Amino acid sequence: MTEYKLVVVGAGGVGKSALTIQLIQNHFVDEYDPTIEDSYRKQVVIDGETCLLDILDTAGQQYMRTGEGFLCVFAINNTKSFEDIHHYREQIKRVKDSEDVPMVLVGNKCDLPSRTVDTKQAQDLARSYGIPFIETSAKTRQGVDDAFYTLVREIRKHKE
């Protein structure tokens, strides 16, 4: 089956591992254990096609070389994580040496009322980048499948 190397990037505490754990193991880790690094494999069906997801859950600032699609995560209650997104995208473009790397902008923790980055602010950023924007919550699983599957679909269009 076709294998997809997905990389989850973003500032610390935004919910990178929470999103990955929820996708892979279907439960919410609410104890914050900062990730030195982690790497996960899961076989899924997206749009009827079977594939193997190879997911690297990175730390918040080689893995950029490997990945085929990038999940760039900020928390909607963390203004600096949203501002940090621009650094990650430029870092991805530098090592990929391309303006067209498959990636998805993810606004996590949408369950929280403590919002400082509003939905239209992030939608604007993703529009300039030419990538999709998904609001997610690792706590309630809203958008989690949508975020990773959209990244896989972005890779698909990019590959064809």
Residues within the annotated binding site for GTP? 10-18, 29-35, 59-60, 108-111
51 vs 67 by CB, closer to ligand GNP:
67
Residue 56's DSSP bridge partners are 7, 39
Distance, in Å, from the CA atom of 40 to the CA atom of 53, rounded to the nearest integer, reads 8
Among 5, 35, 40, 115, binds Mg ion (CB under 5 A): 35
- According to the binding rule CB under 5 A, does residue 123 interact with Mg ion? no
How far is residue 92's CA from residue 90's CA, in Å, rounded to a whole number? 5
17 near Mg ion, rule: CB under 5 A: yes
Bridge pairing between strands 49-57 and 2-10: parallel
Q: Shortest gap between Cβ of 100 and ligand GNP (angstroms)?
A: 26
Q: Collapse the DSSP code of 81 into the 3-class scheme (helix H, G, I; strand E, B; otherwise coil) and give the result.
A: helix
CA distances from 145 to 4, 25, 26, 142 (A): 15, 12, 11, 8
Q: How far is the CB of 127 from Mg ion (least distance, A)?
A: 28
Residue 35 contacts ligand GNP per CB under 6 A = yes
Touching ligand GNP, residues 79-138 (CB under 6 A): 108-109, 111-112, 137-138
DSSP bridge partners of 4: 53
Closest to ligand GNP by CB, 89 or 109: 109
Cα atoms in the Cβ-side hemisphere of radius 13 Å centred on 64: 16
CB of 133 to Mg ion, least distance (A): 21
Q: Where does this chain bind ligand GNP (CB under 6 A)?
A: 12-18, 29-30, 32, 34-35, 59-60, 108-109, 111-112, 137-139
